[PDB]
Design a protein around this ligand. Structure first.
Ligand SMILES: CC(C)=CCC/C(C)=C/CC/C(C)=C(\F)COP(=O)(O)OP(=O)(O)O
Ligand SMILES: [Mg+2]
Length: 300
């Protein structure tokens, strides 16, 4: 099986030069928080290279922000380890209790255990002092990701296979891109008001950056996989399905470009200026780099 022709018109924003530092800080943070990874979990984490993904997405961030973002991703991989191939990933009853505890700690509940203490420390470092608008959007994307493990478990227990569109709308909340877009507002020094978040072209742009990451992750990992759902929808071969997914990924990258053009038009038509225009134009500038940075991580 070969990787298909990728239509990547977006230029690279570079790789953060503090990649080795943020990897050392991440593992030292894990040891400080008492996150005793097992031998299979450690080998997976080293192989996964979370410092490479976080350095390609935020190549211009401060070393402090890079460390905090990388520890969010480090912690998220440990969450995925215990809810996708763990004892709680099968039983929806244990999955419901375990996810509900995390979203409670994320809302300020008293932590219990190494994983909950790490989430509480990550939350207080990231959320304390930021606007209610940012926290409301950040909790929504983070809670939706945590609850997708419960949705996959219940859908698995019910023998229900996801739809084509419902999987793409599940994949948005289950991918890492949506919480990253919230962390991007931190490092870029912007804060979007609810009016800007309600712009049609910005919503289409944010979803396109998210859709591209989710499909690109599934292509580079060909269950609840987009390439597998394409092979089943068409009865094709694995190579034909992968090549078909590469075409859909090209249509998503085109959706990024059209959403960027329409977002500029909506800015000038709505009379947006001041800090809000700087924030939206900053997204038009950076979101191409997020797509390329996420692409270079998965594909390479
Ligand atoms: C909440 C904050 C601030 C940061 C965390 C951001 C998130 C959601 C990181 C998730 C990390 C990640 C890609 C996984 F756990 C795998 O999901 P994947 O979609 O790749 O599933 P697979 O298709 O690989 O099985
Ligand atoms: Mg997973």
């Amino acid at each position: 099986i070969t990787l298909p022709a990728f239509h990547m018109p977006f230029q690279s924003a570079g790789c953060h030069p503090g990649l080795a530092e943020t990897r050392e800080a991440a593992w030292e943070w894990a040891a400080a928080e008492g996150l005793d990874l097992s031998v299979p979990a450690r080998r997976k984490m080293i192989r996964t290279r979370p410092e490479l993904w976080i350095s390609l997405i935020f190549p211009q961030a401060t070393q402090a922000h890079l460390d905090l973002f990388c520890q969010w991703l480090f912690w998220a991989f440990l969450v995925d380890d215990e809810f996708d191939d763990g004892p709680a990933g099968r039983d929806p009853l244990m999955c419901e209790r375990a996810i509900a505890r995390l979203v409670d700690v994320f809302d300020g509940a008293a932590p219990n255990g190494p994983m909950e203490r790490a989430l509480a420390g990550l939350r207080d470092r990231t959320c304390r002092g930021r606007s209610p608008q940012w926290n409301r959007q950040f909790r929504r994307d983070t809670a939706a990701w945590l609850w997708t493990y419960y949705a996959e478990a219940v859908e698995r227990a019910a023998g229900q296979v996801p739809s084509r569109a419902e999987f793409a709308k599940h994949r948005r909340d289950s991918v890492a891109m949506q919480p990253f877009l919230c962390l991007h507002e931190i490092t870029a020094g912007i804060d979007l008001p609810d009016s800007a978040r309600s712009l049609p072209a910005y919503i289409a742009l944010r979803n396109a950056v998210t859709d591209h990451s989710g499909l690109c992750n599934d292509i580079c990992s060909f269950e609840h996989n987009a390439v597998r759902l394409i092979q089943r929808d068409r009865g094709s071969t694995l190579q034909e399905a992968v090549d078909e997914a590469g075409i859909q990924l090209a249509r998503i990258a085109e959706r990024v470009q059209r959403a960027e053009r329409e977002l500029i038009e909506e800015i000038e038509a709505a009379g947006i200026d001041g800090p809000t225009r700087t924030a939206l134009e900053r997204c038009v500038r950076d979101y191409r780099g997020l797509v390329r940075g996420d692409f270079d991580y998965h594909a390479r």
